[PDB]
Design an enzyme around this catalytic site. Structure first.
Site, PDB file in Angstrom:
ATOM      1  CG  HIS A 164      52.057   1.250 -77.456  1.00 53.65           C
ATOM      2  ND1 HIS A 164      51.254   2.366 -77.510  1.00 53.65           N
ATOM      3  CD2 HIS A 164      52.421   0.983 -78.736  1.00 53.65           C
ATOM      4  CE1 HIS A 164      51.146   2.761 -78.770  1.00 53.65           C
ATOM      5  NE2 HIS A 164      51.860   1.950 -79.527  1.00 53.65           N
TER       6      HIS A 164
ATOM      7  CG  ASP B 171      50.315   3.991 -74.585  1.00 57.99           C
ATOM      8  OD1 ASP B 171      51.429   3.553 -74.247  1.00 57.99           O
ATOM      9  OD2 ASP B 171      49.875   3.928 -75.754  1.00 57.99           O
TER      10      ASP B 171
ATOM     11  CB  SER C  94      52.267   4.955 -81.010  1.00 55.06           C
ATOM     12  OG  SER C  94      51.167   4.238 -81.552  1.00 55.06           O
TER      13      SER C  94
HETATM   14  C1  LIG Z   1      46.585  -3.140 -80.272  1.00 50.22           C
HETATM   15  C2  LIG Z   1      46.071  -1.893 -80.927  1.00 50.22           C
HETATM   16  O1  LIG Z   1      45.394  -1.105 -80.303  1.00 50.22           O
HETATM   17  N1  LIG Z   1      46.394  -1.725 -82.209  1.00 50.22           N
HETATM   18  C3  LIG Z   1      45.973  -0.558 -82.982  1.00 50.22           C
HETATM   19  C4  LIG Z   1      46.867  -0.262 -84.241  1.00 50.22           C
HETATM   20  C5  LIG Z   1      47.770   0.884 -83.887  1.00 50.22           C
HETATM   21  C6  LIG Z   1      49.062   0.834 -83.220  1.00 50.22           C
HETATM   22  C7  LIG Z   1      49.713  -0.389 -82.737  1.00 50.22           C
HETATM   23  C8  LIG Z   1      51.136  -0.523 -83.180  1.00 50.22           C
HETATM   24  C9  LIG Z   1      52.215   0.264 -82.945  1.00 50.22           C
HETATM   25  O2  LIG Z   1      52.262   1.405 -82.309  1.00 50.22           O
HETATM   26  C10 LIG Z   1      53.464  -0.379 -83.507  1.00 50.22           C
HETATM   27  C11 LIG Z   1      54.112   0.396 -84.627  1.00 50.22           C
HETATM   28  C12 LIG Z   1      54.389  -0.710 -82.359  1.00 50.22           C
HETATM   29  C13 LIG Z   1      55.415   0.183 -82.015  1.00 50.22           C
HETATM   30  C14 LIG Z   1      56.276  -0.067 -80.945  1.00 50.22           C
HETATM   31  C15 LIG Z   1      56.143  -1.246 -80.216  1.00 50.22           C
HETATM   32  C16 LIG Z   1      55.126  -2.132 -80.557  1.00 50.22           C
HETATM   33  C17 LIG Z   1      54.259  -1.869 -81.608  1.00 50.22           C
HETATM   34  O3  LIG Z   1      52.929  -1.567 -84.126  1.00 50.22           O
HETATM   35  C18 LIG Z   1      51.597  -1.655 -83.927  1.00 50.22           C
HETATM   36  O4  LIG Z   1      50.960  -2.596 -84.350  1.00 50.22           O
HETATM   37  C19 LIG Z   1      49.619  -0.498 -81.228  1.00 50.22           C
HETATM   38  C20 LIG Z   1      50.215  -1.596 -80.605  1.00 50.22           C
HETATM   39  C21 LIG Z   1      50.140  -1.772 -79.241  1.00 50.22           C
HETATM   40  C22 LIG Z   1      49.492  -0.841 -78.452  1.00 50.22           C
HETATM   41  C23 LIG Z   1      48.895   0.266 -79.044  1.00 50.22           C
HETATM   42  C24 LIG Z   1      48.969   0.444 -80.418  1.00 50.22           C
HETATM   43  N2  LIG Z   1      49.514   2.093 -83.098  1.00 50.22           N
HETATM   44  C25 LIG Z   1      48.633   2.969 -83.622  1.00 50.22           C
HETATM   45  C26 LIG Z   1      48.691   4.345 -83.727  1.00 50.22           C
HETATM   46  C27 LIG Z   1      47.630   5.018 -84.304  1.00 50.22           C
HETATM   47  F1  LIG Z   1      47.685   6.362 -84.345  1.00 50.22           F
HETATM   48  C28 LIG Z   1      46.530   4.321 -84.817  1.00 50.22           C
HETATM   49  C29 LIG Z   1      46.474   2.934 -84.766  1.00 50.22           C
HETATM   50  C30 LIG Z   1      47.526   2.283 -84.143  1.00 50.22           C
END
Ligand SMILES: CC(=O)NCCc1c([C@@H](C2=C(O)[C@@](C)(c3ccccc3)OC2=O)c2ccccc2)[nH]c2cc(F)ccc12
Ligand SMILES: [Zn+2]
Ligand SMILES: [Zn+2]
Length: 226
Positions: free
Chosen positions: A44, A88, A181
């Site tokens: 992601h 992922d 992430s």
């Molecule tokens: C959609 C979702 O499930 N959101 C949860 C919030 C969250 C995310 C989200 C998220 C990113 O990773 C980031 C920084 C992003 C980075 C690179 C490209 C796009 C987005 O911005 C976001 O909002 C997310 C987004 C999409 C898919 C998975 C996770 N990362 C996390 C990690 C953690 F340890 C705990 C909670 C979360």
């Protein structure tokens, strides 16, 4: 990282800071060096351009230990699903090999069929947020406990214990969060997991990709695009 501490600088020399550029602007992820030519991270975190900074501690400053390498390819698992967030996992083939040194070097992966059981204490590191809405510029880390499957099955839309790990005790304010992430879950100095996602509140438990489940994909990819 919520509820953690600042890492000793350069103590986690496999850590990769990722800047991901897309039409939505810029986002942050982590990753980890698994060979001198590859960084493992979350699918992601894909974007039109991914710039990798290795050897960093404070990512708001130039540091002489840093190496800047753009990803030549960003290879997402073929079953990555943006809606469910299953599979992922992504490999970044670096445009050049790192200059290996004490600040920049790879981390071990599990052996084939090497598992990771509930109750195990692991460490996660990254440059992500320290609270629901505040960030940081230096690398942080926190110890989290692996949870039983049921904890994540009950609260997430899609959870598969064959491919994911459920991490973090719900009663403790300790978690990976946005910006983390792609970073590693280290258990006894081996990267068993990849930070994927959790609740938007930051309240644990949260979901990691289970590296051991994807070893065939990791190995074949690294061979093909070496
Ligand atoms: C959609 C979702 O499930 N959101 C949860 C919030 C969250 C995310 C989200 C998220 C990113 O990773 C980031 C920084 C992003 C980075 C690179 C490209 C796009 C987005 O911005 C976001 O909002 C997310 C987004 C999409 C898919 C998975 C996770 N990362 C996390 C990690 C953690 F340890 C705990 C909670 C979360
Ligand atoms: Zn330094
Ligand atoms: Zn830089």
């Amino acid at each position: 990282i919520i509820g953690g501490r600042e890492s000793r600088p350069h103590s986690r020399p496999y850590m990769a800071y990722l800047q991901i550029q897309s039409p939505a602007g810029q986002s942050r992820c982590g990753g980890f060096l698994v060979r001198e030519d590859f960084v493992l991270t979350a699918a992601h975190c894909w974007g039109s351009n991914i710039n990798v900074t290795l050897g960093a501690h404070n990512i708001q400053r130039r540091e002489n230990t840093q190496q800047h390498i753009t990803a030549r390819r960003a290879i997402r698992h073929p079953q990555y699903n943006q809606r469910t967030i299953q599979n992922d996992i992504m490999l970044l083939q670096l445009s050049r090999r790192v200059r290996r040194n004490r600040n920049v070097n790879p981390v071990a992966l599990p052996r084939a069929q090497e598992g990771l059981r509930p109750g195990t204490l692991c460490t996660v590191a990254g440059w992500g947020r320290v609270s629901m809405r505040r960030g940081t510029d230096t690398l942080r880390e926190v110890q989290l406990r692996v949870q039983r499957d049921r904890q994540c099955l009950r609260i997430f839309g899609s959870y598969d214990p064959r491919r994911q790990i459920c991490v973090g005790d719900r009663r403790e304010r300790k978690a990976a969060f946005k910006g983390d992430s792609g970073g590693p879950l280290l258990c006894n100095n081996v990267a068993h997991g990849i930070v994927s996602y959790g609740k938007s509140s930051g309240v644990p438990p949260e979901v990691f990709t289970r590296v051991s489940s994807f070893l065939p994909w990791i190995r074949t990819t690294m061979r093909s695009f070496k």
